[PDB]
Structures are given as C-alpha cells and as structure tokens.
Symmetry: D4
C-alpha cells in the first residue's frame, strides 16, 4: 500500500490532486494533497493556508489528530507525521508568499519528529532540522529544534516564569519569541506584536503573510 | 473479504437475508441486511422501521457506533457508513410508505459523508447529495447537504439563537425546519407540529409515516 | 429589620423605589422594588419585564439564587420567596399589558411555596394558589399548583414519555402545555406555537405580551 | 425562640399540629409536628408513616438534610436531631401498630446521637440508648448503639465480607440482621426475609407493620 | 491461526493443557484451557471454580474483559465469547459436582450471545439457548434467555421496583430469582437464601456446590 | 461593631496600624490596614504593593476571597468590598509613585461595585466611578466602569475574537488595552508592551511603577 | 457566651471535664476538655493521645475540621484554633511522657496561627512561637514557625526535589526532618527512622512516646 | 517481521545500535537497543542508566507505556515486555557497576511477566524468576516473584498497615524492604536509608550505584 506520495508517483499517477495514503496499516487510510509540479513531483503537504476560512486556534487533541479539509486548508496531525518519519528518511521544504506577488522559500536537508523515542507522545513531538539551504527566506527554524510542541491549554507555566503573558500559539517554541505560521489571519500589516502569520527573517514582526505551505520528501 | 452487499451478490449468494461485511479490516465483522429483490440486488440498508419497538431518541455515542438488531429495526452507524463511502462511490435510494396502503420513493445520484476531511469526526459527518430523480415523493434532502449532524445533547446552542425551543432530533438540519425520519413513532395523524416520522414533500408536517428504509448502492 | 415592603411602608417610607429587605437574617440584605402606588402600597415585586435586555433562559442555580438588576428586569429567587412565605401569610397579584395600550390583571387570595416541607429544595418548590378573583385576564394558574418547578437542564425525562420534544422553559408545569411568562421575547405576534410570553386565557397561544409583573402582599 | 415542642407547650399553645422550631439559630426555622395528647404533651416527632405514599429508599444527603412533609410522612434529618440532642438531654419513645387493630410501644430512658464528638459527621451519627422500659413490644434497640448510620451507597463494603449480599437499608446496624423500620412498604405478610417495616421482638421477620412513629421528650 | 480448541484438535495436538487462541485477529492471543478428555475432545472452557481463591464479586469492566488465571479459576470475558460465537455455530454444556462425590450435567443444543446485534455492548450481551437434553441436572437456563447480563454496579433500578433489595450478582436475570453459579463461595450448606453457587433444579436454594464448569463446542 | 476604618476613627483610636472590621456579621472579623495620616484619617485600603514578594497572578477564587498579609501586600477581596459598598456610600482615592522619587494621585467622587444587583456574583462585580478630580495623574478609570471583572481562566473567549492573544490580567477591561495595576513586577523600564504595573496617563505603556495603593472613604 | 476555658473558669465552674465553647458565633458550639488542675486552671486542650485507638493518618479536610472524641483522643481543628487565636492573645504549653513513668514539659510565651492573614486557608495555617522556657524537654519548635501546615495528599512536590521519599505526616515542616507528634503509634522503641511519636530533643529519633498533650492559655 | 534482537541477529545485522522491533503487529514498530557484543549477541535491553538526566519517578501510565530515548536512558514498558514474553521463552541477565571502577553481574534461568493470565493488567504484571546463577552480585530477585508491580499512586494502602510511611518506588515489592534499581540518582554514598539505586547483596543499603542494565535473551 502507498505510504506517501512517493509510491503514488509510481504506478503512473504523476498528476496533481487528492489521493490516499496508508501511514498506520492497510486499514483506515488518509486523504492528502500531493504537489507533483514544482521540481520533480512528490512533495507531500502537511499544512496549507490561503484565506481566513478555517480557524487555527484549536487544542492538543486537534493538533494530535488533525483537522481541516484536504482540498482547502488543513493540518495533517502530529501522530501521522511521526508514523511516517519513523519508518523512512525525509527532507523538509517551506515556501511562502506575501500580499503583493512576492515569493520566497527555504530548504532543510533533514526533518524528523521524536527520532528515537520509545513513546512519542511522552516526549512531546520534538523537532529536528539540519542542513539549511537558502532560497531568499532565511533560517528561522534552526534556532529551534530540541523543543517540544506546545499549545495554549497545555503549558502556560514555564512561560509565565521566564517571560510574561500567555503563549496562545501552536509551534516549537524555544524562548519568549512568539512568531509562527500557526497564528491568527490578519491583513497585510498590523500594529500589534507578533501574533499573525510571521516569518521574522523575511518580512519582520509586523507583517502577516498571505499563503503558507510546508512539504516533505524522501531523500 | 466482502466490503458490502455488492460483493455479497457475487460468489453466488443472491438472496434476501442477514450477511456479514468487513468495513474496518479483516477482523470484527458487522451483520447487516441486504435487500436483493427490488431492482438489481445490492441495496445495502442502513436504516429500518416498521413498528414502534426500538426507540430512536439516543445520543451522539449511539449514533456514532450504531444500535438495533439486524433482522428488525436498527441504525448502522455514522462511522461505518463513512468508512464504506470513503473507499468507493455509491448512490442513495429512499423508499417510504404511508399508513393506509400507499408507497413512494426517491433517488439521488451521488451520496457521501464527509468526502475529503482529514478527520471525519471533527467535521461533524456532513452530508452531500446531488442528482435528484423523482419517483413520486419529492425532493427533501437537496435543501440540506453541507450541514453537519446534530443531536439533543451535542449542540443545542446555535438553535436557541436563530429559532426558539430545543431540537431533540437526529438528522442533518439547515434551519428551523425540524422534520426528519428519525423522530417519534406516532399514529396516522397528530395535532402537534413536525415531531414524528415526517417527509415534508409527500404528506406534510402533520402525518407520521408507517415504514422507512434508506439504501445505498455502488454506481 | 424590615422583612418585606410592609415594614418599609412603616417608619414613614411611603414612596416608590429600590429598598433593602432582610429575608435570611440581619446580615446580607437584598435590594428589591416596592410598588407603593396602585391600591394601598406594599406590593413586593419578584418579576419584571418591559423589553428584551436581560435573557431568561438560565438554569437551576440561576433560578434558585436570582439574577438581574433591581431597577430593570430581574427574578428574585425561589430561595428568597420561600424564606419570605415560610414566616408570614401572603397574597398574589399578576398584571400584564400587550402591545397597544391594552391592560388586564388577575388576583389570587393565597400564595405559598412548599408550605409544610422539611426541606424545600427536596420537594422542588411547589406552587399553591386559591381564591381566584377576576380582573379581565382569566384563571390560568389554578389548573397548576401541586406541580414542582422545572427547567431545561433538570428534568427532560417524563416530558419525553407523556409528551414529545423538550420543555426548554421555567415554570410550574402540569401537562404538555408550554405557555408561561418566562419564555423568549418575541414581537407582537409569532407563527410558532407557545414559546413567547403567553397568557392563554387573555390573548391566546400566538401572542407575546409587552410587560409582565408579579407581586405579593400580606393579608 | 422555641427550640422544640417542650417550649411550644408553654406560652399557652397546648394543641396538636404543625409548629416552628429553631434548632440552628434565630433564622431559618423548620416546621415539625408535636403530638401533645398522649401522656403529658411534648413528644417531638422525627418519623411518621401510615400508608405508602412517600418512598424511604433515599441516600446519605437526604437522610442528612431531611425529606417529606410536616403533615404527612417525613424524616426530620440527622443534622437537626444531633443539634437538638447536643444542647439538652432527651428520652426516646417508640409506638407501633400492626395491621389488624393491635398496638404496642416501647420506652428508653436516654437518647443521644454522637454525644461527645468534635465533628458529628466524621463519627457517623452513632446511636446511644439505655434504660429500657417494657410496654409490650420488646427490646430491639439495646443490641445496637455504638454503631454508626449506614446506607446503600455510603458503606456497602464491610458487609460483603462478614455477610453476603448488599444491605440497602437506612438504620444503625450491628450484624447481618437487616430488619429496621425504614424499609419498604409491603402488605400484612410477605414470603421474603426481613426487608419491610419489621420490629423483630413483637411480630417477627415475616410481618411488615402498618404505622410507625418515633418521639423524643426532655427528661 | 487457531480460533478455538477445534483447530487445536487438528495439527496433532490432542492433549490437555493451556493453549493459545486468536479470537480478535492474528495479534494479541489469549490463553485458554481445552478439555480433550470427556467425549471427543474440543470443549473450550469459559468458567472454572474448585475452591475459594479468586473472588467473583467484580464489576462490569472485569466481566467484559475477563479475569483470573488459566491454570486455576478464571472467566474468559463476554467480549471474547461474543467474538467467537459471532463467526461460527456452537453448542453449550454445563457439568457440576457437589461436596460428596456426586455428579450431574446438562446439555443445550444452541448457544450464542447477541446473535444479530449491530453493537453487542449496546444490547447488553443477551443469552440464547435451545434444545435442552437432560443428564441428571435439570433445565434451569431455558426460563432465562432474552435477558441481558447484569451486575451490582450497573442496574439496581428496575430490581427495586419489581422486587426488593439489591441484586449483587452477575448472570442473566429474568425475575426476582437470585440463584446463579457466580455467587459467593460457601461451604456444603447455608442458612441464608440463594447467595452461593446454586443450581435450583438439582439441589435447591440452600446448597452451594463444589465445582462448576461451562464449556462450548462447535456443532 | 466597627464596619470600616471610619468607625475605627471614633472611640479614640486615631492611629496607623492593622485593625479588625466586621463586614459580614458580628462573627468572623477580617484584619485590614487603615492609613489615618494623609488628609483626615479613614481611607480604608484594599490594595498594597511596594516590592516583589507576593505574586498577583491568582485566579477567580483568590480574587473573590482575598489573599496576602495585612502588614505587607494584599488584596481585600471583591466579596468584602461589595458587602461594604452595598450598605454605605464611599469615595475612591488612588495614589501612585514612580521609581526615582516622584509621586502623584487621583480622586473619584463616587465608588461602588455592582450597585443594584440581586446577585452580585452573577453580574460579575461591575465597576462604577464618576466625578473625577485631577491631582497630576490623569483619568484612567472613567473610560471603564460598566465593565465586569475578568481573569485568565474565567472568560478568555470574547477577547480572542475582537483582539488577539489572551489577557492574563485581573481588572475591569473595556477593549484591547491591557494595562492595569494588578500586573507583573518588572524593573523601571521594559521593552515589552503593557504587561506590568502601568498607569497609562502618568507615564505610559512602557514603565512599571514602584508602589500602588487604593483607598476608599465615606462621603 | 464562653469563648474558651477562661470564661468557663468564671461563673464558678472550676472543675475538670467536657464543656462547651463558642468559637464561631452563638450557634453550633463545640465540646472540649479543659484541664483545671495543673497550675491555675484554664489550659484548653487541642490534642491528646494515650493509646492506639484513633488513627491519625487522616487528610486535609479532617485536619481542617477536626476529628475524634472529646473524652478520649481528638484533634480540635485548624479552623477553630485560628478563630480562637484571631481574637485574643494566647500562650502555648506542651507536656509529654515516655513508657516508664518519666515526665518532661516545655513552654512557649507566644502562639498564633496565621496572625495577619486576610484569608487563613490561602496562607496555609502557618506557625509562630516565641519566648521558649525550658522544663526538661528542650526546644524543638523554634526551628520551625513561618512554615505552613502540610499533609500526605496536599504537597508531595517540593519534598521530592529537596529531599527524597514522601512525607506522609501532618505538622509544620521546615526541612527534611520527619519527627512530629502526629505519627504512627509504635511501642517503646523501633528500628525504623523517625516515623512514630518523636520529640528529638528529649529522647531521640528512635523512641516513640506514650502520651502527648498540647494546650493553650490566655496571657 | 523481527520480534526482538534475536531475529535482528539474523539477516546479517550483527552490530551494536538502535533497531526496530514488531511486538504488537506488523504496524507501529518500536525502536530499541540491542547489545550484540557481550556473550553471543541478542540481549534485548529494557532498562538503561548511566547518569542523572532522565527522571524515573513517573506513574502507572508511564511505566505501562514506556518513556525515555533509545540511545540514552529509557524504560521499554510493561505492556511490550509482557507481549514479548507471552509468545516465546526468555532468560534474564542483570549487570551492574559501582562508582569507582568495579563491575558485577547476575543471571536467572527463566524470566516471564504474568505467565498465564487472561488479562495481564488485572493481574498486576507479576514477576517470575527461577534458576539463579551467581556471578559475584548475589541473589536479590528470588525473594520476590509472585508479587505485583506497585507505584506511589496506585496502591499506597496495604503498605501503611504492615509497615510505616509511603513507598514512592517502582518495582516488585515483597515486604518493607524498599531497595530497588528504579530509585533516585544520588552520589556514591548517602546517609539516608535505601532510597537510591541499591542492590542489596553486592554493596548494601547505603550505596547508590553508577550504571544499571537489564537484558533478556531467548533460551
Ligand atoms: C476561502 O477559500 C476557500 C477555498 O475553497 C473558499 O471555498 C472560500 O469561499 C474562501 N473564503 C473567502 C471568504 O474568500
Ligand atoms: C500582483 O499580480 C496581479 C496579477 O493578477 C496584479 O493584478 C497585481 O497588481 C499585482 N500586485 C502588485 C502590487 O502589483
Ligand atoms: C414489532 O416488530 C417486531 C419485528 O421483529 C416484532 O418482534 C414485535 O413483536 C413488534 N411489536 C409489536 C408491538 O407489534
Ligand atoms: C390496505 O390493504 C390491506 C391488505 O393487507 C387491506 O386489508 C386493507 O383493507 C387496506 N386498507 C385500505 C385503507 O386500503
Ligand atoms: C431596555 O430597557 C432598559 C431599561 O433601563 C434600558 O436600559 C435599555 O436601553 C432598553 N433596551 C432597548 C434595546 O431598548
Ligand atoms: C398607545 O398609546 C400611545 C400613547 O403614548 C399612542 O401613541 C399609541 O398610538 C397607542 N396605540 C394605539 C394602537 O393606538
Ligand atoms: C396516603 O396518606 C396521605 C395522607 O396525607 C394521603 O394524602 C394519600 O392520599 C394517601 N394515599 C393513599 C394511596 O391512600
Ligand atoms: C379493626 O377495627 C376496625 C374499626 O375501624 C373494624 O372496622 C375492623 O373490622 C377491625 N378488624 C379486626 C380484624 O379487628
Ligand atoms: C485453591 O486451589 C488452587 C489451585 O491451584 C491452589 O493453588 C490454592 O492453594 C488453593 N487454595 C486453598 C485455600 O486450598
Ligand atoms: C468421596 O470420595 C472420596 C475418595 O477420595 C472418599 O474419601 C470420601 O469419603 C467420599 N465421600 C463420601 C461422602 O463418601
Ligand atoms: C519585600 O517587603 C517585605 C515587607 O514586609 C519584606 O519583608 C521583604 O523582605 C521584602 N523583600 C525583598 C526581596 O526585599
Ligand atoms: C531619591 O531619594 C533618595 C532618598 O532616600 C535618594 O537617596 C536618591 O538619591 C534619590 N534619587 C533620585 C533619582 O532623585
Ligand atoms: C484506649 O483508650 C480508650 C480510652 O477510653 C479505651 O476506651 C480503649 O479501650 C483503649 N484501647 C485499648 C486497646 O486499650
Ligand atoms: C511506673 O510506675 C508504675 C506504678 O503504677 C510501676 O508499676 C512501674 O513499675 C513503673 N515503671 C518502672 C520502669 O519502674
Ligand atoms: C547524561 O548522558 C547523556 C547521554 O546521552 C548526555 O547527553 C548528557 O549530557 C549527560 N548529562 C550530564 C549532566 O552529563
Ligand atoms: C577508575 O578508572 C579510570 C579510568 O577511566 C581512572 O581514571 C580512575 O583513576 C580509576 N579510579 C579508581 C578509583 O580506580
Ligand atoms: Ca504552552
Ligand atoms: Ca424539566
Ligand atoms: Ca443490575
Ligand atoms: Ca506535603
């Protein structure tokens, strides 16, 4: 059974659209969007935003099990990505676009979630990335990694000691920085601090992007 | 293994009775009733009523997992119908019968439950039907679709704002019309408003039917 | 200390406005509106509506302990009225007005809540009324009495057996009748059945009033 | 303020009816029934049965706070009896009546509930009776005393070790004898073992009585 | 994989002892005792008692999932027996022995648990038996069947209405009868009513047996 | 008994120290600090900070009942302030001091908490202040009033719609301005936005003060 | 009403036995043992042990509200002692006896519980003692004080960091020392570390005493 | 699929590193560490410590599911070890090392967890070891076996009766000896009793070891 979009690239399915993958056994498949157009196909997607629509506040269960629709905006789910990356090696790519027409992207050579954990949930779905290659966006994930996933209803204890105020965000946080792609959908610019879709290296802490997309591919 | 009644029709088992199907793996089958005598066989049945007996009030867990008996009245369960419809395409048929001796039916070209959701339970098991084909009963499911399943204990909060009073029903609702085939079992006619087994197009909002049956078939 | 508006009528306070009463000891008083203008003063008020403003859906705790503001719309609370009527004899009066300018009223000679109960909450705050005297509104409370108070989150079991659908109302209910002064605030008229501020004897089941007020007085 | 029926006997109120007593402060009185016609008046009543009506199954909260009506059948409540007996000494009288026309009675010289406990609820509302005086009914409370109150939901754990089956009763128990005056209301005679209103000394374990009444008086 | 002791009788394992069976897939097997000595082998066992040791009070989860040890006393579990009997036809046999040396047995031609239920737990694991053949013990299970399984922590509502006192037993109960093989382990005889290991047809309501064993076999 | 510091000023107790007050009956007094040296004595104090020590994060229960020490920093409690202000009229004074050596103050003519609510807790302990009188600090409480008390665990739902991020503060809020005197204890100046002890009119949103004190007096 | 044994020493009650005191209003009194024999009377007791009998494991609620019997062993309750010491000044005395006949005692000039706390429970019922005067037992409470009360079900977090293992004791703990008079009742000597009734200054960490008693008196 | 390190030794993978094993079906593998260099390879490792790092306090869920990292310190999990040992026989080896430079080891001929239980969790994951073979460390697991697993939150009730104080440990206990290899990480020597990593036979109850490792192998 096809584990990812790589096996879908075989058996002559070199097209674009929603398919089925089998990350946790031959039963209960999952629909996912494979982008076979950019460089050579593959590029399994696990995040997508282009307009307001689906809200991204959510909680621990919703991030562990996934939400959204496959043809629109969605988040695959930490459990599924962990089960995928436990078996095979992979590689991460992130591309994003602001309001005008502007474009940029970034590439990382290695990507995994809780590499050698006996129980992935008990560790907390930590991040790992290595081998940054620029594309005009900058390195904003290498400072992280080694940090567990977090939410607004889980943690809210060590943040109040080291920093002030509550996080109210879902990403791999290292310090008091509150910039991530899982924030609220604001317009072109905002006056508040980092609470929208922010990529600090490209635009800054006062510009919320238009489209986000994170993909992985075997290497 | 057989997935539904269409595979039961093969291996020379063309008859009318309770069989076994395997929607969620080779283990733990489910007994169901296939009505192989109307048009061409197949016609997997996920709802049945002919007298009072089984009560249909229930809650979210019961409608998610299923209740009743295979030979009498029952409800297959939203989870199993979702698992069936995800893999293969289908087509919906409804046939109904008044108290005196009359019968009617309706047909829909496409039937699916939460088509492209990463998690079906988070979406709410929405309905989708298109391609109506008249048979003397009218169109009473096209106005809906795009709406989620609600019960008397899950939601009961957005209804008291637009409308008054509580719903106390189990169907895909769109507005304050509270007539559905999963209501109470009253006599031929009643003075209260739509709170029995009502099909709005055929009889109206003041007549509770005698027998109901919903069947799906591969197209 | 003044227990009710009768003691406030003494010590030369024969005016109209918000005062203080001491129903449960010399500590923790309660503000209440005394209407000393209609016939001879007194007339302690325990209900008031004149526009939408305060919602009346509420629950068991909110009806047991009271809610609202004294200068506007409010509900005193079953505990306070029980403590008042346990000590002294009283008498009930209800007056109401529709949209135009129309007026009417009704009078009852006796009023009490759980007269001889060892534990008032365990009985359920039953109603008692005797000696109806007409004023142009009719008798719509004598059919009740002997019936416990009810709500939408308490009961919802014996209603489904005897009647269909859920109550979603707060009053002393005897049968499947769903007309009371603690319903939703609709306009002059509505198409739905009794779910607004309905007094069946005066207007009917399709007219929601404008103003309601229930008072008590010693006799 | 009057504390019990003994103070009601003064101020010229020698009669038979429901009065008010103040066991827990000058506020929040409790209505009770004083039987001032048997020997010398007084005789505060904390239990009454003459027909089926009120059910006596109940739980720990109900027996702690009290249930029933003052004119009919009721249970005063362990808390109020404890508060009464703590301040003043008393004396217990029980009178009972079979179905046909017969009557009997018993007398105890001293009655108290949890005499010298810092917290009565933690002790379990133990019983203490001494100085039996025969009247034709026998001694059925001297074997007990020193034992705490138990119910069908509080304890139900030490009984399944010494004896078999569950208790489902509300009295001060000593061993596997499960006969008490707070049982079910059966007819004159029954085939099952002691599970009705049984007084072991007078009739036996196979006869459920018709009327019960427990009264206390100052000594 | 071997589903029961019948497949174990194949592949040349015609011996007596603890084996493994696969009732719910090729993973997570179950150890069970097969009695290949009486008539022709097979005879999968799902109950065993010969001395006090393991207690049988337990609850709903413990009866649904099973308890005990395979070489001693144990109860297989309603889920496992349901999964077994859903697939293949079977036949029930019960044999028992009192204190002296005495023996007896009974046979039933048909045995199943929730035959045509869409969700077995929702029905309640009902019993079915047909075709009694005597062996000196009598028919004491045909009066039952059609009745759901029950326990001391589940039900305790309809028993108090129809009968008095609490059940405190685990079997398929039809009326106020409290005799079953899942009771307390008493000696040869007892003075209390049916609360030990009682088979009413053979000995009576005052004799608790020594050994019990219930087996099933394909037919 | 003394109700506040105004009655403490009488009976010849004009001094500065911790005394006892009786807001909720003759029993269970509360120790408080009266500052009888500024203008005319009285000046009951319900808030105090001069260094870090006590933490002010807390929750709804702590702000309802009160925390801290009488001689150091503390919070009197919304319940006691409500009980005090309900009986008598009062008048609010606030005095504040920057880090270097500067001081300022403000005065309000009328101060009350939930003026005419039947139940204060259901209203939310709203604020009401009128009649500002400048002293060099500015008006920072007139924009509020009519708003209820909120915390980081009670509400946190209407804020994420109008504004972004969570509040994590304890004051009467009106809009997304999150500056109040019950924040964190930072140094003289900080780079983050208003999350310390900020008084907007005097210094701004980037300076956390050194000492705070709120006092009320009878008018 | 008599607040303590000092008022009982008035009105000519200079005897020894169980009396009543009124620490929280004129209602709900408390029985207590006053020792008017040692030096000059008074000596209100709040702890007593002379044999095994009553267990002292208990929890937070049992220590807050009190337990035991007044004529035997008991613990008054932190709430009652706090209410007593809030109003009047007092003085503490402790005396104890080992197995043989040996005796000793200690005296402290000042004793209080949460002196200036706005909410006593929120602080945690801290200890204060000053002015030690020897009597042959030594000073073992001055090292403590300023430390909150603790139990086995409350805390169990900071103990695991600073020390190892769980406390399982009820006293005012300062460091890893586990010697107190609220431990288990062992014989004359034991081999384990401090887990019995230990007073380190007199006997040591391996000797459990015979009798304990703590009293207070006004000064 | 490989079930343990013994099948990893085949297919030419004789090395030392982290591999994958399939104890609960073909899906969801678990990463583990095989130490293929001591005697003959194999030697699956289900415990590892060499410095402080990971904390071993934990609870019942963590010990049931497993925690830690494959390359560092970890605990495999009672469920997976039970699943492994149920299918095949094994043999236990323990090797330990003091702080200075010394090492030792012990061997047991048979190792299993809950051998013949219908439900392993209900039994408590009991231990069974036989056939000790000395290597210079002594026998410290033969006294146990037949005992269930206990933690600081599961049981903590039968211990306070036989012994004093709470356990706060995770091992198979028999009596009040509280020395096990899953304790706290202290230095070379400590003054407190057995609460670190203690092996009683080799060093004693006052020395916490440096490195631990438990391995099993097929026999
Ligand atoms: C957002 O995009 C989705 C993509 O299908 C579309 O369905 C939806 O209408 C869009 N919403 C708005 C407000 O543009
Ligand atoms: C972005 O591209 C679109 C082309 O569809 C154009 O209409 C728009 O003006 C561009 N934006 C800017 C800022 O030029
Ligand atoms: C309802 O139909 C079922 C069909 O299985 C039948 O068993 C039952 O007796 C019927 N009930 C009545 C009241 O006719
Ligand atoms: C309906 O058909 C049945 C046939 O079973 C017949 O007995 C009955 O009279 C018919 N009734 C009507 C109203 O047509
Ligand atoms: C409703 O009446 C109250 C009475 O004070 C008033 O404050 C409020 O503004 C009114 N609301 C509307 C919508 O008229
Ligand atoms: C009711 O009285 C008011 C007087 O303020 C008047 O304006 C209104 O027209 C009256 N309503 C009708 C229906 O005449
Ligand atoms: C039981 O006695 C009460 C006395 O108040 C009476 O009201 C009721 O009707 C009686 N019930 C029956 C069934 O006789
Ligand atoms: C009991 O006394 C009543 C008097 O009300 C009488 O009618 C009845 O016959 C008597 N019965 C017996 C058995 O004495
Ligand atoms: C009960 O039987 C089992 C069977 O193995 C045995 O282990 C146990 O010792 C027996 N107990 C008694 C009390 O005879
Ligand atoms: C039952 O059989 C055994 C044989 O081991 C014998 O010892 C015993 O006496 C028999 N019982 C009776 C009542 O004879
Ligand atoms: C804070 O002030 C209090 C005043 O009671 C004082 O006891 C404490 O030591 C101070 N803390 C610091 C860190 O100065
Ligand atoms: C503030 O006043 C203090 C007096 O205690 C003085 O020591 C300090 O130098 C002053 N600082 C400033 C900035 O005025
Ligand atoms: C312990 O002392 C109490 C004091 O009254 C006594 O009642 C009890 O019998 C004693 N227990 C033992 C075991 O000596
Ligand atoms: C303690 O005193 C008692 C007097 O009753 C005496 O019997 C006992 O021997 C004394 N203990 C010792 C150790 O002498
Ligand atoms: C403990 O050992 C681990 C081995 O992975 C190492 O990463 C860590 O730094 C060590 N910690 C210390 C304090 O030496
Ligand atoms: C232990 O061995 C190490 C080798 O790494 C050595 O450096 C150290 O001195 C030795 N210590 C002892 C006490 O033998
Ligand atoms: Ca967090
Ligand atoms: Ca209701
Ligand atoms: Ca039951
Ligand atoms: Ca603690």
């Amino acid at each position: 059974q096809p584990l990812d979009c790589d096996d879908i690239y075989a058996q002559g399915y070199q097209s674009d659209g929603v398919y089925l993958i089998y990350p946790s056994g031959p039963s209960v498949p999952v629909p996912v969007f494979c982008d076979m157009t950019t460089e050579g196909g593959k590029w399994t997607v696990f995040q997508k935003r282009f307009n307001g629509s689906v809200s991204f506040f959510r909680g621990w269960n919703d991030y562990k099990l996934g939400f959204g629709r496959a043809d629109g905006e969605y988040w695959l789910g930490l459990q599924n990505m962990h089960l995928l990356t436990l078996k095979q090696k992979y590689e991460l790519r992130v591309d994003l676009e602001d309001f005008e027409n502007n474009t940029a992207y970034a590439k990382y050579a290695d990507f995994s979630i809780s590499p050698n954990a006996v129980s992935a949930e008990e560790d907390g779905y930590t991040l790992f990335v290595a081998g940054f290659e620029d594309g005009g966006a900058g390195d904003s994930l290498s400072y992280h990694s080694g940090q567990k996933f977090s939410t607004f209803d889980r943690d809210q204890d060590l943040f109040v000691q080291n920093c002030a105020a509550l996080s109210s965000g879902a990403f791999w946080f290292r310090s008091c920085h509150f910039a991530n792609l899982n924030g609220f959908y604001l317009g072109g610019s905002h006056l508040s601090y980092a609470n929208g879709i922010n990529w600090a290296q490209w635009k800054g802490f006062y510009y919320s992007l238009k489209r986000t997309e994170m993909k992985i591919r075997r290497a």
